[model samples]
Target: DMANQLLDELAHGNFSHLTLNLSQNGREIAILQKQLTGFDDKQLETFVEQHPAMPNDTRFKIMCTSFLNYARDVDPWSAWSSSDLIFEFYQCLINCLINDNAPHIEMLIPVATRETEFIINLAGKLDSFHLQLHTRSHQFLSHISSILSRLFNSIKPPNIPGKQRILLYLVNKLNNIYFRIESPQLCSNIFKNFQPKSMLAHFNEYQLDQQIEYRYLLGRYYLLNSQVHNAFVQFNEAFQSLLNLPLTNQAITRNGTRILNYMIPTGLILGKMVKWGPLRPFLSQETIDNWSVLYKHVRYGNIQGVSLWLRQNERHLCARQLLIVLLEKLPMVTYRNLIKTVIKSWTTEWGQNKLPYSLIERVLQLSIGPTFEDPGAQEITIYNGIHSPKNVENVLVTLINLGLLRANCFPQLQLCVVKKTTMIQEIVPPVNERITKMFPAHSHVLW
Candidate 1:
C-alpha cells in the first residue's frame, strides 16, 4: 500500500520528494528505490513541454548517436540503456539550463542497481560507478567537467555562427572548468574543432560578450602553450571589447580588470610595455603595483629584484600560474639586458669584437649582489651570491642557442666573438624582436 503511494508521487513527477526519500530509510523507500531501476521513464515520460528541440533531422541523428556511444564509453554500467541515459542526460541539462527549478545535479539520472534493475535519483549514478560526489548535497566536479565536454561535443557542428550562439555561453563555462581544475590539457579537446582560423571565425558573428569570452579563453589557451604573440592578440581583443562599455556596470568592469590581469603580463612577455594612465580605473591597485614592478625589474635586468619580488609574492603569482614562467622566463630577459649593457659599454676598451668571459661574469657577479661590493676594486666575497664565470658562460651559451644574441663562444680564449658593437653597431637585436624569436610562434607550430 505504502510503496504504491510513493510510486504514485514519482509518477506524478515529484522527483524532489523521491530524492529526499532516497536519503531516508524505510520499507517503502527500499521498494520505491528498487522499482526505480532500469529505464524507469514513467517520471521521464510525463514532462510535457517541448523538451527536446531539433530542426535538422540528419545532423541531429548524428549527434544523438555520438552522445550514446560516448555515454556508454564514460559510464558503462549496463542496467541503464545508453539511449535512456542520453535522453535523461540531455533532458536534465535542458531542465537545469532552462526553466526547471531543480539544482543542476539534482536533475534525475537512472542509476544502475542490479543486472535487471536501475535506480533513478540525483547523480548517485556517477557515485555508483565509483566516480565521485564529495557528498550527496554537493555537485561533483567531474560531472560538470564531463557535462562541458559532452555539451561541447554536441554543439560542435561548426555550423554558421548565427545558428550556434548556444556555444558561446558553454565555451566560457567549460574553459573556466579546465583552468580551475588545473587540467589545461582539456583545452586541447575543445580547441581541436576551432584549431584553424577557419573555424574561429564563427563567434565573431555574435555580440561583443560572446566575442569577448571566446577570445579570452583562446588567449589563455595560447598563453599556456607559450604562444605570446597569438595570446596577446586574443587577450587584447578581449580587453578592447569591454573597453567602451558603461563604467556604472560593475559586471563589465569586473571582467575588464580580469582581462588586463592576464593581458598585461602576456603583452609584457612579448615586450610590449603597457602604460598605466588609462588602465588605472580598470585595474586594481595590487595589479597596478605588481605589473609595474615586474616590468621595471625585467627592463633593467634586475635579476635579484625579480627573484625577490617572486618570493615575496609567491602565493600571489603561483595561484595565478604565473610564478614559474616569470621565474624561468623573465630572468632570461634580465640576463640578456645585463649582457647587452656589458657588451655596449666596453666595446672600445675590451676590444671591438670580443667579450672576454671574465668581463660578462664579473658584471653578472655585480648584478647578483653581495659579491665584492666593488668587484673591480677587489673587495672580499662577504655573504656573496655571485655567479661563477662558468655559470655566466651557461647563460651566454643559452642566449646564443635561443637566437637572442648573435655571437660565437670561444671558450678556449674565454671570449665571445661578435660584430664591432660600437655606439651604432649593435650585436643584439631589438629586445622585442629577440623575444619573439626566442619563443616559437603558435601559427607555425600549429600549422
Candidate 2:
C-alpha cells in the first residue's frame, strides 16, 4: 500500500513525496530502500516489475524506475552512467512540468525547484568527481536545458504558470557548469545558441538570483571580450539590482560586493566614479584599501603611484582578470587628470586658457616615471609616448577626441586651446559626462 501510494504521488507529478537521500531525509524512497534491503539483484528487479507504476515506455513508468534506482544506490555518478534509463527521469519529469496547470505554488513550482535541486546536486559531483563524470553531467543537463529552452520559446499556452519561468533557472545551471570549467567559449555558446527574443518579455517572472546571476555572467563575458561599455551596462545592472535587496541578505550582499569589484574599474575606465561607502559593510577592509590606492592615484594624476600599486597588487588583479584592462585604460584617466592639474595651476596669463607646448611636455616628462635619474618605474603603460613632442601632441589629441578635454591641439605651435568654463570647472568635462555622441541632435534651426 505504501509503495502504491508512492507511485500514485509520482502519477500526480508530486516529486517532493520521495527523498533521494534516505539516510538523512526519509520518505517513500528511503522507506522503500529499507523495506527492500534484503533483496538480491534478481529479486529487486522482479519486485520493480510487479509493482508497475505504469506500463514500460510510458512517462510515468520511467519516473518509478528512475526514482527506484536513485533510491536504491543514490549515487548520481554511478546512476549517471546507466544513461539510457536515468534520462527518462528528466524526460517524464520535465514533461510533467510542461503540462502542469495552475495550482501554481503546490503542484508547479515545487516540482520545478526539486528537479533543479537534483541537477545542481549532480553537478556538484563534477567538482569533486570531475572529467570522468563530466560528460554525463552535461549530457543529461544539456538535454534538460534544451528541452526547457524549447518550451520557453514556444507560444505562451503550454502551462498556465508560465513555462518560461524555468528558462533562467535552467540556463543558470549551464552557466555555473561552464563557469567552473574555465571554458568561456562553451559558456558563451549557451548564450549564443539559446536565442531568447520573446523570453526577454518574461524577465519579471525570473527569480532574483537568476536575474542577478545572468547579469553577472554577461558582465564577465563582455569584459573578457574587452567590450568595456557592455561590461559596465551589465555590471551596473547587477550592482543596482543587488544594492536594493534586503539588508539582512548576507549572501546577496556578498554578490553585491562582487559586482562593485568589476564596477569600480569599469566605471573608472568609462570616466564614471562611484563611492564604495554605501556597501562598505559588505567588503573587507583590505579590498577597500586596494580600491582607495587606485582611486587616490588616478584622481591625483599619480601614474607612478598607481603603477606601484598595480605591481604590489599584480597577483590579485591578475587573478581577478582585470590587470590588462586597468593597465591599458588607466593611462587615459591619469593623462586627462594630469592636464586638468596643469590648467588648474595656470596662474600666469590664465585668460588665454591655452597651455603652451613646452609646459605640457615638461609636466608629462616630470609626471610619468617622475625621476629618470634614480631609476624608471618600469611600469608598462600603453600611452608611453610622453618623451616625444609628436607623442605628447598625439596623447592630447586623443583626449580631445574622447570629449574628455574641451580643447583644440595646434601641433605646429604646440599650444592646446582650452574652452574655459569656470575657475572650479576648468579644461576638462565631468568624467561621467565624457561620452560624446557622433551625430548632432535635430535642432529647431535645422528643422
Candidate 3:
C-alpha cells in the first residue's frame, strides 16, 4: 500500500510533497521528545519496536536522543557526553536490533558509528594491558588462582548446596581458560586444592548419584588442569564409586552428549602424556585402544550417540586410530622425483588398458606440467608436501599401499617413530576452471 501511494505521487511530479511530509514527521518526533520527561528507556524501546522504520533514519534518531538526554541533564549537555554512556546506549540499541539471533546484524559493523569506534578503542586498550601483563610475568599462576578464588567466593552464598556445584563449574572454566592461554603451570596451580574425595565429601550432603557426578566432574577438572597424578587418582576413585551406584537401565541423553564432546581432548591429553614420558605407565593397553577410537571419531566428525558408550570405550577407539596412523606410515620409500616416476609408471600401465584416451597422459599434460612450472602449485601438490610430519607419515603409508615405496626406504619410517599413513590422495587444484582436470575429480584432494 505504501509503495503504491508513493508511486502514484511520484508519477504526478509530487516529490516536493513527499519532502514536506518527511519534514512534518521529523518535527513531530522533536515535539514528542519535548513533551516527554526523557527518562523513558522502556517507552523508547516500545516506540522503536512498533515503528521499526523510524529508527533507520540515523539523523532523526540521534537528534531525538541527544535532545532527550540534553533536556534530562539541562544546561551543560556537552559535559554529559561520557564515553561509557555513549557506549552503553549504542550497545543497548544494537542489542535490541541485532541480538536474539537476528540475521544480517553483522553486516552493520563496517558502517561507521561513534559507539563502534569507542568500543573498539576500549577493547584494544584492554587487550594491550592483558598482553603486557602476560609478557611481563614468569607465571600468571597467582593471577589465575586469585581469579578462581574470587569466582568461587562470589558464588558461595548463604545455605545453598548449589554453591559447591557452582564452584565446580567455575573451576572448570578456569581450567579451560588456562589451557587456552597455554599457561600449563597456571592450570596446575588452580587444581592444587582439587581432591576428588574432598569434593565427594562436600557433595555427599546432596543425592548419592549427584555426588558421583560431582566426583566425575572433579576428576575431569583435574585432568584439564593437567594434574595428571591427582587426575589419575581421582579418575580411579570416581570409576569405582560409579560402579557401585544403583544402575539405571534408563540412559541420560544430556550426560551422553557431554561425554561424546570430550573425545578429542581425551585423545590429545593422552597423546601428550605418552610424549611427556611421565604418563606412559598410567595408561593401559585397553586405555590406548579407547584413545584410538576417540581420535578417529573426532578427526572424522563421527561423534554421535550415547555418552556412556563413548566414554567407556573412548580409550580403545583412540588406540585403534593411533595404531592405524602408526602402521600406515611405518614403511617409507625415498625418491628423487617421486611424482614424475609415479606418473610415468601410471602412463605405461594405462597404455595396456582398453580406454580410448590416455588418462595418465592427460593428467601429466595438464596437472603435472602446470604444477612443476608454478612454484605456488608445487607448494601444495604432494602427499609429502615439503616434508611435513603428517605428510611424511602419509608418504610412507602411500608407498606401502602402492607397493612402489618400501618399509625400509627411510630409517624413521622403518622404526615406526613416525606415525600416520601415506596420503594416496592427489592435490586439489586452484579455484580456476582450467585447474579442474588435475585429479580424477573423485580422487581425494590433500588440502
Collision count for each candidate, in order: 2, 0, 26
Per-residue accuracy of model 1 over 1-447 as CA lDDT, tens digit each:
343453344334344333212224334444443554342333323221122332223332233233222322323234343334544444343333322222221223221111011122333354354333234432333455575565456543433442144455556666766775567778777777643323444445656777687788878787777666788777876787688677897887888888787788777666678888989888888778877787888787777677667767778767766766666566667777777777777663466677788778777766765434445536543122343334767988988887667888987888888877455235777767766665645542222
* Residue 439 in model 3: lDDT: 16
Task: Point out where model 1 deviates above 4 Å.
Answer: 1-139, 156-163, 195-203, 348-352, 370-389, 437-447
Best by TM-score: 2
Q: Cα lDDT of all candidates, in order?
A: 0.57, 0.63, 0.36
Q: Which of candidates 1 and 3 is the stronger one according to TM-score?
A: 1
> Which 10 successive residues of model 1 have the least lDDT summed?
111-120
The lDDT-based order of candidates, best leading, equals 2, 1, 3
Runs in model 3 with CA error above 4 Å? Answer: 1-37, 40-149, 154-166, 172-189, 193-203, 206-229, 236-447
Q: By TM-score, how accurate is candidate 1?
A: 0.64
Q: On TM-score, who's better, 1 or 2?
A: 2
Q: What is the C-alpha RMSD of each candidate to the true structure, in Å?
A: 10.8, 6.1, 23.2
Q: What is the TM-score of each candidate against the true structure?
A: 0.64, 0.75, 0.25
- Better-scoring candidate (lDDT), 1 or 2: 2
